[PDB]
Motif scaffolding. Structure first.
Motif, PDB file in Angstrom:
ATOM      1  N   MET A 154       0.741  -1.140   0.192  1.00  0.00           N
ATOM      2  CA  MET A 154       0.084  -0.023   0.141  1.00  0.00           C
ATOM      3  C   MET A 154       1.153   1.213  -0.026  1.00  0.00           C
ATOM      4  SD  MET A 154      -1.913  -0.423   4.110  1.00  0.00           S
ATOM      5  CE  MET A 154      -2.204  -1.851   3.389  1.00  0.00           C
ATOM      6  N   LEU A 155       0.407   2.064  -0.410  1.00  0.00           N
ATOM      7  CA  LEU A 155       0.761   3.148  -0.241  1.00  0.00           C
ATOM      8  C   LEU A 155       0.938   4.710   0.850  1.00  0.00           C
ATOM      9  CD1 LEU A 155       0.022   4.978  -4.027  1.00  0.00           C
ATOM     10  CD2 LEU A 155       2.045   3.330  -2.697  1.00  0.00           C
ATOM     11  N   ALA A 156       0.106   4.101   1.315  1.00  0.00           N
ATOM     12  CA  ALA A 156      -0.595   4.861   2.940  1.00  0.00           C
ATOM     13  C   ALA A 156       0.465   5.252   4.264  1.00  0.00           C
ATOM     14  CB  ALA A 156      -1.393   4.776   3.790  1.00  0.00           C
TER      15      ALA A 156
ATOM     16  N   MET B  17      -0.566   1.246  -8.015  1.00  0.00           N
ATOM     17  CA  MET B  17      -1.044   2.281  -7.203  1.00  0.00           C
ATOM     18  C   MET B  17      -1.420   4.142  -7.546  1.00  0.00           C
ATOM     19  SD  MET B  17      -3.138   1.985  -3.469  1.00  0.00           S
ATOM     20  CE  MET B  17      -3.152   0.341  -3.138  1.00  0.00           C
TER      21      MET B  17
ATOM     22  N   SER C 125     -10.859   2.676  -2.738  1.00  0.00           N
ATOM     23  CA  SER C 125     -11.283   2.764  -1.318  1.00  0.00           C
ATOM     24  C   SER C 125     -10.601   3.824  -0.995  1.00  0.00           C
ATOM     25  CB  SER C 125     -10.710   2.132  -0.100  1.00  0.00           C
ATOM     26  OG  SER C 125     -11.367   0.258  -0.729  1.00  0.00           O
TER      27      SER C 125
HETATM   28  N1  LIG Z   1      -5.449   1.523   1.742  1.00  0.00           N
HETATM   29  C1  LIG Z   1      -5.059   1.805   0.332  1.00  0.00           C
HETATM   30  C2  LIG Z   1      -5.919   2.292  -0.116  1.00  0.00           C
HETATM   31  C3  LIG Z   1      -6.276   3.520   0.273  1.00  0.00           C
HETATM   32  C4  LIG Z   1      -7.140   3.871   0.937  1.00  0.00           C
HETATM   33  S1  LIG Z   1      -7.200   5.893   1.830  1.00  0.00           S
HETATM   34  C5  LIG Z   1      -5.580   6.030   0.570  1.00  0.00           C
HETATM   35  C6  LIG Z   1      -5.088   7.466   0.883  1.00  0.00           C
HETATM   36  C7  LIG Z   1      -4.019   7.605   0.680  1.00  0.00           C
HETATM   37  C8  LIG Z   1      -3.170   6.080  -0.222  1.00  0.00           C
HETATM   38  C9  LIG Z   1      -3.772   5.777   0.374  1.00  0.00           C
HETATM   39  C10 LIG Z   1      -4.568   5.084   0.063  1.00  0.00           C
HETATM   40  C11 LIG Z   1      -3.562   2.166   0.321  1.00  0.00           C
HETATM   41  O1  LIG Z   1      -3.195   2.022   2.104  1.00  0.00           O
HETATM   42  O2  LIG Z   1      -2.602   1.967  -0.291  1.00  0.00           O
END
Ligand SMILES: N[C@@H](Cc1csc2ccccc12)C(=O)O
Ligand SMILES: Nc1ncnc2c1ncn2[C@@H]1O[C@H](COP(=O)(O)OP(=O)(O)OP(=O)(O)O)[C@@H](O)[C@H]1O
Ligand SMILES: Nc1ncnc2c1ncn2[C@@H]1O[C@H](COP(=O)(O)OP(=O)(O)OP(=O)(O)O)[C@@H](O)[C@H]1O
Ligand SMILES: N[C@@H](Cc1csc2ccccc12)C(=O)O
Ligand SMILES: [Mg+2]
Ligand SMILES: [Mg+2]
Ligand SMILES: [Mg+2]
Ligand SMILES: [Mg+2]
Ligand SMILES: [Mg+2]
Ligand SMILES: [Mg+2]
Lengths: 257, 257
Positions: B109-111, B153, B202
Motif C-alpha cells: 500500500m501507499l498510505a 496504485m 477505496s
Molecule cells: N489502503 C490503500 C488505499 C488507500 C485508501 S485511502 C488512501 C490514502 C492514500 C493512499 C492510499 C490509500 C493504501 O493504503 O494504499
C-alpha cells in the motif's frame, strides 16, 4: 567556537550545491532551514514534479521519438532468469540478489525481460526491433556514495540491422547531450560510459554467446543507465541518496526541516 | 467438428474485445494471429507507448494540474510500517505481505509513505497540503480475475482545509470522468468507488484514530486507485492480466504469436 563534526553533518544535509565563520551553528542552521523551505514552497507553487519521475518522462519521450517501443515488464522475476544470465556463485552479482519466496527475486537488471521481448516481438515486428524500459532495479550493495539498494535503470536494445558500435555510440551521445550531461566512452564489445570516475552506463555490442540461452540469433546493441546517477551528475548532488526514491529527500531537498 | 476447450482457450488469448462456426481451429487461429501482429505493428509504427506507462503519465498530469505534489517514495519499506498501519494477524492483509530480508517488505500500500510525507511537508508547505504517488504495490492474492500479485496504485491525499466528503467525491468524479470511466460511489467515512462489482478505489475521509500513530492531527481526505483495474475497465479486458506488467501481454495483445 568551532562547529562539531555532528553539527557540520547536520548543515551538509541542509546544504544545496548552489549555496554560497563567526556565525554559530543555530544561525547557520536557521538560515539553511529557511532556504530549503522556500525551495519546497517554490516547487509546490509552480511545477510540482518529482525529479525522478520527470527524468523518466523525458527519457521516455527521447526513445519513443527515436523509434523505440516502451516496455513495462515485471519487477518481480523468476530466480532462473538470474542463472540463465550466466550469474553463478563465482560472480559478484550472485550475492547481491534480493530473494523473494522460493522461486522469485527482485530484478537486479533489465536484460532478461528485454531479451524475452526481443525474441517474442521478432515474430511480429519489422527489422530492426527497438525497445526500451525504465523502472526499479534492486541490488544489495556495501557502498553508499554512488550506490543505492533500490535504484532506477534505463535499458534499451536494438536487434537486427544497424546494430553497430558506431550507431550505439551515436545513440548514447545524442542521449546524454540531450540531457546536458558530460561524458566519455571507455572500452562482443563491452563499453562503459563514464562521468569522471562515475559509471553512468555499461553498453554492449552483440552478438554475444549468452544470446543463445535466450533464443536470440541476431546482431544487437544496447545499454543500461542508472537514472539516479544521471540525476546526481546533472544536479551536482554530493551523495546519490539525494536522487533516490526517499522519505528523507525530495528533489535533493531535505524533508527533515 | 467442435473446438476443444484447450483450443478455445488458445483463441481467447488471441481474441481482442473489438473482434467480431464452420471454420476449423487452424483457420481461426491463423486469422487472429494475423490481426494481433498488425496491432503490434501499428503501435510500433505510430505511438509506441505502453498503456500502463501512458496511463501513469496522464494521471500524473491530472493531479499536478490540480495542485498535487508528485511523490516518488520507496517501494521497499520497513516491516514496522505494516504493523503501524494497524495490520495485525487478525486481518487479511497480514498474510498477503511479501517479506524481504528480516526488516523489510514490498509495500502492499501507499498510505505509510504518504502519511510520512504529510507530516514532514507540514513544516514547510502552506495549507492545504496536497500530494500523490503512482507506483508498484505487492500483495499475495489467491484470485486471478481481478487481482494481480504485482500491481500499480495511485494514491492521493489532501491535508488541512477543504478536506470534506464533498470535495473528495468531487475529485474522484472529475478524475474518472476525465479518464472516461463509468462509476458509482458506495458508502471517519470509508467510501468505495465501484464499476459494477469491480472495486476501482477505496477512499477515506479523515481524521481517523490511526492518524496519531503517524504524527497526523489534521483533517484529511484521500483515495487509492488500481491502475490495472482502470485499464481493464477502459479497454474492456476480460482478464486483468492483460493490463499488468507482463511478458505475456503488451497493451492487451498476446506476445505469444
Ligand atoms: N489502503 C490503500 C488505499 C488507500 C485508501 S485511502 C488512501 C490514502 C492514500 C493512499 C492510499 C490509500 C493504501 O493504503 O494504499
Ligand atoms: N547499486 C546501484 N545504484 C545505483 N545505480 C546503479 C547500481 N547498480 C547499477 N547501477 C546503474 O546501472 C547501470 C548498469 O548496471 P551495471 O550492472 O552495468 O552496473 P555496475 O557495473 O554493477 O555498476 P558499478 O560498477 O558502479 O557497481 C550502471 O552503469 C549504473 O549507472
Ligand atoms: N491484488 C490487486 N490487484 C490489482 N489491484 C489491486 C489489488 N489490491 C488492491 N488493488 C487496487 O488498489 C485499490 C486500493 O487498495 P485496497 O487495499 O483498498 O484494495 P482491496 O479492498 O484489498 O481490494 P479487493 O477488495 O478488490 O481485494 C483497490 O481499490 C484496487 O483497485
Ligand atoms: N547489465 C545491466 C545493464 C545492461 C547492459 S547491456 C543492456 C541491455 C539491455 C538492458 C540492460 C543492459 C542489465 O542487464 O540491466
Ligand atoms: Mg555493481
Ligand atoms: Mg562497473
Ligand atoms: Mg557496468
Ligand atoms: Mg484485497
Ligand atoms: Mg475491498
Ligand atoms: Mg478497498
Amino acid at each position: 567556537p568551532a562547529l562539531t563534526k555532528s553539527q557540520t553533518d547536520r548543515l551538509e544535509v541542509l546544504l544545496n550545491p548552489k549555496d554560497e565563520s563567526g556565525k554559530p551553528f543555530r544561525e547557520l542552521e536557521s538560515e539553511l532551514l529557511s532556504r530549503r523551505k522556500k525551495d519546497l514552497q517554490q516547487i509546490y507553487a509552480e511545477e510540482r514534479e518529482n525529479y525522478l519521475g520527470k527524468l523518466e518522462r523525458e527519457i521516455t519521450r527521447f526513445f519513443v521519438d527515436r523509434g523505440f517501443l516502451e516496455i513495462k515488464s515485471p519487477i518481480l522475476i523468476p530466480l532462473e532468469y538470474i542463472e540463465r544470465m550466466g550469474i553463478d556463485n563465482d560472480t559478484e552479482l550472485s550475492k547481491q540478489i534480493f530473494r523473494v519466496d522460493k522461486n522469485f527475486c527482485l530484478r537486479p537488471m533489465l536484460a532478461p525481460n528485454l531479451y524475452n521481448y526481443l525474441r517474442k516481438l521478432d515474430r511480429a515486428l519489422p527489422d530492426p526491433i527497438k525497445i526500451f524500459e525504465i523502472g526499479p532495479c534492486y541490488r544489495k550493495e556495501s557502498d553508499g556514495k554512488e550506490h543505492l539498494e533500490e535504484f532506477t535503470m534505463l535499458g534499451f536494445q536494438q536487434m537486427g540491422s544497424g546494430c553497430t558500435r558506431e550507431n550505439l555510440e551515436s545513440i548514447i551521445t545524442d542521449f546524454l547531450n540531450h540531457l546536458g550531461i558530460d561524458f566519455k566512452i571507455v572500452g562482443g564489445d563491452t563499453l562503459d560510459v563514464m562521468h569522471g570516475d562515475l559509471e553512468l552506463s555499461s553498453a554492449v555490442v552483440g552478438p554475444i554467446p549468452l544470446d543463445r540461452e535466450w533464443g536470440i540469433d541476431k546482431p544487437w546493441i544496447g545499454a543500461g543507465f542508472g537514472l539516479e546517477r544521471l540525476l546526481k551528475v546533472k544536479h551536482d548532488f554530493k551523495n546519490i541518496k539525494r536522487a533516490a526514491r526517499s522519505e528523507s529527500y525530495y528533489n535533493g531537498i531535505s524533508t527533515n526541516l
